Structures are given as structure tokens and as C-alpha cells.
Amino acid sequence: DTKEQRILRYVQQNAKPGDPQSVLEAIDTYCTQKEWAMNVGDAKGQIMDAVIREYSPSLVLELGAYCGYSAVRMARLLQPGARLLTMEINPDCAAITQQMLNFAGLQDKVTILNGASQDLIPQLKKKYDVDTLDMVFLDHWKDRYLPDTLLLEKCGLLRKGTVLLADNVIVPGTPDFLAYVRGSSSFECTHYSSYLEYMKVVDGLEKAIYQGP
Numbered sequence: 001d002t003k004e005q006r007i008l009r010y011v012q013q014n015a016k017p018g019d020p021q022s023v024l025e026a027i028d029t030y031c032t033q034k035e036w037a038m039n040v041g042d043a044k045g046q047i048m049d050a051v052i053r054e055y056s057p058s059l060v061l062e063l064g065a066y067c068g069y070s071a072v073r074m075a076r077l078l079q080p081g082a083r084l085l086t087m088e089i090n091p092d093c094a095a096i097t098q099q100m101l102n103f104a105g106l107q108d109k110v111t112i113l114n115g116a117s118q119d120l121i122p123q124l125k126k127k128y129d130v131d132t133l134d135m136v137f138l139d140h141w142k143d144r145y146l147p148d149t150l151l152l153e154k155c156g157l158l159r160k161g162t163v164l165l166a167d168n169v170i171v172p173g174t175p176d177f178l179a180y181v182r183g184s185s186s187f188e189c190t191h192y193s194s195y196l197e198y199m200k201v202v203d204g205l206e207k208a209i210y211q212g213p
């Protein structure tokens with residue numbers, strides 16, 4: 001089996017069904033004590049929680065589900081009727097994410113999409129009935145943060161006040177994305193310095209609030 005399957009099995013055997021906080025704790029324990037994995041982790045997760053609570057978004061898009069850790073983290077804080085769409089290009093990890101969300105009891109809040117962001121973003125309006133997004137969490141290929149931000153704007157998916165929140169802007173890093181949003185009058189940016197998941201290595205989240213054209 002794979003590391004991702006071991007993480008799912010550990011949640012199933014060490015968390016409580018229907019209890020998202022137990023699921024997060026189980027994943028963080030496994031990834032601290034057994035095998036590192038690229039979940040956002042609790043350090044950066046606590047900053048995400050604070051941002052989600054500030055904005056109470058009704059419709060969130062996540063680029064890069066992995067095993068569903070960030071999807072559980074965000075979906076557990078959504079208000080009744082609010083929704084998360086999460087894109088995952090690896091079909092094995094899409095299946096693990098769906099199972100993780102089922103276990104946590106969050107499956108009615110989340111739609112896990114299996115494909116590439118450049119293919120799926122242009123289908124959001126017609127196929128998934130999206131008007132505009134309230135928040136976007138970027139956690140997929142680091143060289144796609146910038147092109148997919150521009151693709152979201154082209155597709156008319158951003159509105160004044162849409163919150164982009166970007167993982168890993170320091171490690172592995174997303175230098176073109178940061179330079180772009182920080183230099184653009186169309187974004188209001190804030191950096192939240194933190195640590196790479198499970199490691200004593202500096203990383204950070206970038207919040208970039210879209211201001212219209």
C-alpha cells in the first residue's frame with residue numbers, strides 16, 4: 001500500500017467517525033510520528049481556520065486536495081448550506097480524499113473533483129453551477145498558482161472581495177505568484193509567516209484579496 005492509504009487507515013482506526021477534529025488530530029499524529037506527508041498541517045491550519053472564520057465563505061474552491069486534510073479543516077468551519085469544491089489530479093488521492101470526508105461526516109458539504117485545474121476551472125460555471133467564488137485555497141502545483149489565478153479571473157469566477165489563500169509560498173515557494181499579486185493593484189495582500197507542515201522550517205501563507213479589474 002501507499003503512504004496515503006496508510007494515513008487513511010490510521011484515521012479509520014484512531015479517529016471517531018463523524019468527528020472532524022479527531023480526523024485532523026489523527027492525521028497530524030501519524031505524520032509527526034510515522035511518515036511525513038504534504039498536508040497543510042496544524043501550524044498553517046490554525047491560520048487557515050482564523051481566515052475561514054473571518055470571512056465565513058459560502059463557496060470555496062480548493063486546488064489540490066491530496067488526502068483531504070485541508071478539505072476537512074475548511075469544511076468543518078463552513079456554515080450550514082456552504083460548500084467546498086476541491087480539485088485533485090491524482091485519482092488515488094481523489095478516492096482517499098472522498099473516503100476521508102465520508103469518515104469525517106462532511107461529504108454533503110464537499111464535492112471532490114478528479115482532474116487538472118486548467119481543464120476543470122473553465123467548466124465551473126456551467127457544470128458545477130458556480131457564479132463567483134468567495135474564497136480559493138491554492139495548494140496544487142506551485143508553478144500553477146499564477147496561471148490559475150489569471151484563468152480564474154478570465155473565467156469570471158472572481159468578484160470584489162474574493163479571498164485567495166496560498167500555501168507554500170516560501171517552501172517550496174511560488175515566486176512568480178507572489179511577485180505578481182504583491183505588485184498588482186487588483187490584489188490586497190497579507191503574508192502570514194508560519195512553518196512547513198511537521199517541520200522546523202519556515203513557510204507561510206499568502207492572502208490576496210481580489211479588488212476587481
Ligand SMILES: O=C(NCCCCc1cc2cnccc2s1)c1cc(-c2ccc(F)cc2)cc(O)c1O
Pocket residue numbers: 038039040063064065066087088089090115116117118139140141142167168171172196197
Ligand atoms: O507539491 C506540493 N503540493 C502540490 C501537489 C500538486 C498535485 C496537484 C496538481 C493538481 C492540478 N490540478 C488540480 C489539482 C492538483 S493536485 C507540496 C509540496 C511540499 C513539500 C515537498 C517537499 C519538500 F521538501 C518540502 C515541501 C509541501 C506542500 O505543502 C505541498 O503542498
Ligand SMILES: [Cl-]
Pocket residue numbers: 038039040041065066067068069070071
Ligand atoms: Cl492538505
Ligand SMILES: [Cl-]
Pocket residue numbers: 040041042043044196197198199
Ligand atoms: Cl504542523
Ligand SMILES: [Mg+2]
Pocket residue numbers: 038039040139167168
Ligand atoms: Mg501545501
